[PDB]
Design a protein around this ligand. Structure first.
Ligand code: NA
Length: 227
């Protein structure tokens, strides 16, 4: 795709999120850079409204899959870069087992040289004393596979995957993710064969930062089709 060309170097990233979970409204801004040749993302996210009212790990999946490293033999399956620069809309529902759900809508597109992810998030049906609002999740590394399928009807893709968040008591909190992506333009995109994105991250802190924030280092690699 011509879009793929926009990702051959290091690209600045800007993320903006407006959230409302159970009436607790918050905003997050993120900045960093992506190097899709290596599937690599380095970002710092800041809560700009004060303290974040949900755990940072619950927002990781929401807070730019156009930065995945696609193997050469799979580059015909990279929907995300093929929709650039006009971009795509990503929507998810995230069901936290035995608790509430997030619904998200993200618009991902270039503004000049910067890849921008503008997100709205709504959470409903949460327990004030459950694992999310009651801050019971661990901050350990999240990894897993995002299973992608083509959606010819919307000229896009669907995806599904589960995140198993470790909880303090030693069990896990499931977050079942359902995803759709639709291009913004009218023209053709790459509609992929079934495959997945193998995604891993590590969370850290900026020692100089006094605001509530998270630093993330992430690698995203497409896989599952053999040469
Ligand atoms: Na690159």
């Amino acid at each position: 795709s011509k879009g793929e060309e926009l990702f051959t170097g290091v690209v600045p990233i800007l993320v903006e999120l407006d959230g409302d979970v159970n009436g607790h409204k918050f905003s997050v801004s993120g900045e960093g850079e992506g190097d899709a040749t290596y599937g690599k993302l380095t970002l710092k996210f800041i809560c700009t409204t004060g303290k974040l009212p949900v755990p940072w790990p619950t927002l990781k999946t929401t807070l730019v899959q156009c930065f995945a490293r696609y193997p050469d033999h799979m580059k015909q399956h990279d929907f995300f870069k093929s929709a650039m620069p006009e971009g795509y809309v990503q929507e998810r529902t995230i069901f936290f087992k035995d608790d509430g759900n997030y619904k998200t809508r993200a618009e991902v597109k270039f503004e000049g040289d910067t890849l921008v992810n503008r997100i709205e998030l709504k959470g409903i049906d949460f327990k004030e004393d459950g694992n999310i609002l009651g801050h019971k999740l661990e901050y350990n590394a999240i990894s897993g596979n995002v299973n992608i399928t083509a959606d010819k009807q919307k000229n896009g893709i669907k995806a599904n995957f589960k995140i198993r968040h470790n909880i303090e008591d030693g069990s896990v909190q499931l977050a079942d993710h359902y995803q759709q992506n639709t291009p913004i333009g009218d023209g053709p995109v790459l509609l992929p064969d079934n495959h997945y994105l193998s995604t891993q991250s590590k969370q850290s802190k900026d020692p100089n930062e006094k605001r509530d924030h998270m630093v993330l280092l992430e690698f995203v690699t497409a896989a599952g089709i053999t040469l």
